[PDB]
Every structure is written in C-alpha cells, then in structure tokens.
Amino acid sequence: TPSHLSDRYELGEILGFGGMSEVHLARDLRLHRDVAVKVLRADLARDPSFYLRFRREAQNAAALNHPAIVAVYDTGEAETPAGPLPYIVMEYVDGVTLRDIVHTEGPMTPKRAIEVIADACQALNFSHQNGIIHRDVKPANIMISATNAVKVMDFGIARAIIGTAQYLSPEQARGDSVDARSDVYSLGCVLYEVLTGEPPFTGDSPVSVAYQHVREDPIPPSARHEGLSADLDAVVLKALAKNPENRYQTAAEMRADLVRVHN
Ligand SMILES: CCn1c(-c2nonc2N)nc2c(C#CC(C)(C)O)ncc(OC[C@H]3CCCNC3)c21
Numbered sequence: 001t002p003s004h005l006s007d008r009y010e011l012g013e014i015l016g017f018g019g020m021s022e023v024h025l026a027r028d029l030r031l032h033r034d035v036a037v038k039v040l041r042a043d044l045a046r047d048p049s050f051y052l053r054f055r056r057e058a059q060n061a062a063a064l065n066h067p068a069i070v071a072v073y074d075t076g077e078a079e080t081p082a083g084p085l086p087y088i089v090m091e092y093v094d095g096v097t098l099r100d101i102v103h104t105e106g107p108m109t110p111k112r113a114i115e116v117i118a119d120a121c122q123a124l125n126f127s128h129q130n131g132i133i134h135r136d137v138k139p140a141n142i143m144i145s146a147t148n149a150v151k152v153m154d155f156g157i158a159r160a161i162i163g164t165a166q167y168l169s170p171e172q173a174r175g176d177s178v179d180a181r182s183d184v185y186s187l188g189c190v191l192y193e194v195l196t197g198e199p200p201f202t203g204d205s206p207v208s209v210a211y212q213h214v215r216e217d218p219i220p221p222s223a224r225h226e227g228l229s230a231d232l233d234a235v236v237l238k239a240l241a242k243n244p245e246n247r248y249q250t251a252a253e254m255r256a257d258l259v260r261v262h263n
C-alpha cells in the first residue's frame with residue numbers, strides 16, 4: 001500500500017476494509033478531484049481465484065451508469081515491492097451507510113426509510129435490467145451522501161445474467177439459482193431494519209437465521225415498532241414472501257408500492 005498508485009492517485013485516509021480488500025480516500029492528481037480507491041490485499045493478491053473476482057467486480061460495476069450506483073472511473077495495478085497490486089478507482093461518496101445510521105441513531109422515520117429504499121429499488125432495478133444481480137444487498141452496502149443521495153456499492157459478489165445470513169433469501173441461501181427477486185427479498189430485510197431497528201430474523205448461528213428465512217414468517221413491523229402503518233407492513237411482508245412468485249417480481253414493482261404508501 002504505497003503512497004501513490006501509478007504516480008497518479010495519492011492515497012489518503014482509509015474509509016473501510018474487509019477480508020480481501022480495503023477502500024481509501026484518494027486524490028486524482030491529474031483531474032484534481034477526490035476519489036475512492038478499492039485495493040485488493042497484497043497479503044493474498046497472488047491467488048487468481050481472487051484476482052478474477054476483483055477484476056470481475058470492476059467490470060460489473062463499470063457496466064452500470066446510474067446516479068444511485070457508485071460509479072467506476074478507472075482500474076489497474078500498482079507496482080509494489082510485493083508485486084502487482086490491483087485497484088479500482090471510483091466515485092467518492094462523502095456519507096455513511098444505513099448500518100451506521102441504525103446503529104448510532106436507531107430506526108429511521110417511515111417517510112425517510114421509504115424514500116431511501118425507494119431510491120435503492122431504482123438502482124437495483126437498473127442493475128437487473130442490465131443483467132447484473134447484486135447478491136449482497138445489506139445495510140452496509142447502501143450509502144447516504146451529505147447530499148442525501150442514495151448510493152449502492154460493493155458489487156464484489158455480483159453475478160451477471162455468499163452474503164450475510166440476516167439478509168439472504170430462502171433461495172440465495174442453499175446455493176439455488178438467484179434472480180432479481182432475490183435482491184428484492186434482501187432489500188425487504190433492509191427496509192425492515194431501517195424501520196424497526198433490527199433485521200427480521202436474528203439467531204445465535206447462521207443456520208439458525210437461515211432456518212427462519214425458510215420456515216418462519218416475519219413479525220409484522222408495526223408490532224416491533226410504533227408509528228408504523230398497516231400499509232407499510234404489507235409492502236415489507238410482500239418483499240419478504242418465501243416463494244419468489246409471491247414477492248415483487250421486480251425492484252420497480254416494489255418501488256411503485258412504496259410510492260403508494262408515501263403518497
Ligand atoms: C468503504 C466504503 N465503500 C465505498 C465508498 N466509500 O466512499 N465512497 C465510496 N465509493 N465503496 C465501496 C465498495 C465498492 C465498490 C464497487 C462499486 C467498485 O464495486 N465496496 C465496499 C465498501 O466498503 C466496505 C464496507 C463493508 C462492511 C464493513 N466495511 C465497510 C465501499
């Protein structure tokens with residue numbers, strides 16, 4: 001992790017990190033603008049099993065051009081003493097995730113949660129229309145900028161044409177085929193959690209959470225948290241239907257129903 005990548009992007013403070021990658025705030029010295037740079041860890045940057053996933057993340061994200069989807073600007077490899085260092089240059093979102101918001105400020109107001117999630121539906125529907133399934137819809141992958149613009153990010157496991165158990169769908173868990181309606185389900189879990197302050201199913205173990213996704217129906221949000229209408233309950237519970245046929249068939253359908261509740 002040198003000071004500059006290709007004598008172009010001067011890395012700044014770290015914004016976040018996971019098991020395989022990290023994300024820095026950086027400065028594009030040619031264009032004189034702030035960008036975010038996602039870097040593949042050198043600790044295990046040799047394994048082509050990762051190298052392909054990282055390159056494929058950059059391509060899937062770059063295939064999408066949408067205001068609610070973090071934009072990819074560039075990509076390459078930085079020459080380092082340890083070897084080649086892959087990196088993705090992308091739009092910098094000066095904001096916080098829904099995970100941070102719920103953890104520090106508790107559930108959102110119904111009016112706001114509907115607007116944020118309705119914007120996320122648009123991003124996902126656009127992705128689905130272009131043949132890319134996110135697979136990792138969760139509160140940590142949706143951002144709200146200082147502009148209050150919603151930004152979906154982290155395509156790291158997106159499929160063209162696993163995630164956290166509390167947000168997996170009955171089909172995404174257990175390896176079955178996943179389609180747009182699987183992202184809808186995950187988005188329903190996100191909506192459930194920004195409204196009530198907790199996801200629909202918690203458990204001491206992953207198999208405990210997975211089992212509930214398949215067999216147990218969710219507690220209606222209005223029962224978990226006050227100030228929640230019965231019309232919002234229906235939207236959330238339809239997104240959390242067990243059978244894909246009963247869910248919203250597209251993220252756009254889910255958004256249309258959220259607008260009805262708002263208005
Ligand atoms: C660190 C936050 N963060 C950001 C940005 N933060 O400000 N501007 C950003 N852009 N982008 C990502 C991506 C990505 C991607 C593409 C679109 C190229 O696929 N993946 C992951 C990120 O955090 C990881 C989260 C995950 C959970 C805990 N650590 C923080 C990102």
Ligand SMILES: [Mg+2]
Binds near residue numbers: 140154
């Ligand atoms: Mg993430």
